[PDB]
Design a protein around this nucleic acid. Structure first.
Lengths: 57, 70
RNA sequence: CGGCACCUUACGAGAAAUCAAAGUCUUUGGGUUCUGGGGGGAGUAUGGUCGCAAGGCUGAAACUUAAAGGAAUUGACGGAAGGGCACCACCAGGAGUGGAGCCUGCGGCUUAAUUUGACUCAACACGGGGAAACUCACCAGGUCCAGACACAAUAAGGAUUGACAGAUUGAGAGCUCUUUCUUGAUUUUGUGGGUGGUGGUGCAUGGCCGUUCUUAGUUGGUGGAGUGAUUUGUCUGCUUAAUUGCGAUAACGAACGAGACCUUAACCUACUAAAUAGUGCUGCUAGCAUUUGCUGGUAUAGUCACUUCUUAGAGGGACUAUCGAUUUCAAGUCGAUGGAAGUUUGAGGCAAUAACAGGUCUGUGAUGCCCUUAGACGUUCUGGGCCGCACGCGCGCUACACUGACGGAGCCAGCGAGUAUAAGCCUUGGCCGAGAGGUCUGGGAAAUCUUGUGAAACUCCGUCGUGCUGGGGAUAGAGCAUUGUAAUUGUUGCUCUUCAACGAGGAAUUCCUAGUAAGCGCAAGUCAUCAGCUUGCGUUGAUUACGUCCCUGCCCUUUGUACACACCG
């Protein structure tokens, strides 16, 4: 989160502006790259073709 | 609101301030140049020439500096 | 066949609640009687009529008024029901507070001024608000423009800037005066226009903070429901700190909050390194004993070794692990075994949506508007006030004694902070004085020195011996110092003397569940001086629960409402 707050000096008074941006953690370099509760279990490469007693050499 | 700060009263008169004495050619009342012819030039080295004095109640004083004696 | 009814749906109806009639009614017409035409005045007056009477029937107008009313929605509230939760609630206790003296804040009275904000929690040791000057905004008095800029007047025959002697002043402010010595266009006078303001407005605002609310709550897309406001999702049941999960389901998939997260406390003889940490060995030593031992000292060269202790980075470690039982066998829950750790491991930072006319214009060169701006509400100088004291209240400190006061002796932590041409920082050692304190050196910009901060409670051995007494240390005099330009209204420190209330505190009321309460100091902020204050830290270390909705409240559902400024209605 990055916040910038400014005082806009209008004719009738002062207006205040706040701008928050939640940047995506992927573009974060020098820090965490995901939310704490973000979990990244991946897929599987278990499937394959087999045969009982092979020994190739 | 701080009891609405009021007018304030005066026990002294408004002091008219100081005015500069507009003289008429003081050079023409120092120097005395008649046919074919001035107090003291401030003995201090701060000026050399160009300083005059006004004598009153035993006072010889300098203005562009301040020496005085007797 | 006739009845009294009932159940489902919504054909169709309706403003909806609901209705098999309240349907077949803008696609308006089966027959017929009665009634209503905004709310009141008013079913009143009057006349008639019936009645024994009480009264009944018939039945106006003047005048008054912008709504009254119906059904439903969301919220709020209930001395309505059900289900949960909390030491800012109770239970059971502890320490108390409220009673005393004093410190300190608020009010009131006083005053020249006793500046001002805040008033239930969410004002009252709060404004980091411990004010001698400054601070400072208040009071009495004196100066300066530091009024940029454009014009206009003026002016080098001087616009004006200053400063000697006396007067003057609180004053060695040429502030103002007899006095003209100096300056030369930088400036005085006027308009317009600025500038500053702890002046007003926090009910015109920004930002910040506090609170609702430390609870579990909040929201849209698409779908379903409803004419609509709205609703479902967001829930019967169980479970949890928790809208958090198991699940249930006109929803489905999501989002914020919660949880995760981050900081810190606890464990690691398992990696990595310590001349700013330590332990050893080995030199050179000392007291005892002489067995080579027991106690220590020194060597940042001994060109010694290492990392239990300490430090800090890289990690590991709890996941309720194993086991025994109950639970929709599901999420969980209770016990054991293992363990440093089994309440979310303990403690915190962070923290949704909607709000409050909560506080702050006195933090701000953050601000709109109003005011003021030269005899100034700008600023500065001297002095005083914020401390004034019949009185009421809050946060506190010290006490009322023997579980105690003293007097010697034992001398055990942890969090931190520190400067050099100062206007001086932490200050060690040496030397003086009873002490406060003074002086000469030294170390430290700091794991290096202050510092092992040898803190205080606490332990021992003695004096006191039940009493306002060696309890308690107000008030007051004398004296010695320290900081500061200035201690009078005692700044504070030390010595002698004075020895006041108070013998455990009424009705009331606050805080708290384990290394917690209570006790006890210590450091840091304020700071020239001053801590009975806060923010932290450690030392000693408990009784009592480990439950409940009686009180004060909070959350969810149902229900009623003539409330919505929301029952302080």
């Amino acid at each position: 989160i990055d916040i910038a707050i400014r005082h806009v000096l209008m004719r009738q008074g002062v207006l205040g502006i706040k701008v928050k941006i939640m940047k995506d953690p992927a573009a974060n370099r020098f820090g965490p790259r995901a939310l704490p509760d973000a979990v990244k279990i991946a897929e599987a490469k278990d499937e394959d073709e087999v045969i009982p007693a092979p020994t190739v050499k | 609101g701080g009891k609405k700060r009021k007018k304030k009263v005066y026990t002294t008169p408004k002091k008219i301030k100081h005015k500069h004495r507009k003289h008429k050619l003081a050079v023409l009342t120092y120097y005395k140049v008649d046919n074919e012819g001035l107090r003291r030039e401030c003995p201090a080295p701060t000026c050399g020439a160009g300083i005059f004095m006004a004598n009153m109640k035993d006072r010889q004083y300098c203005g562009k500096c301040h020496l005085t004696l007797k």
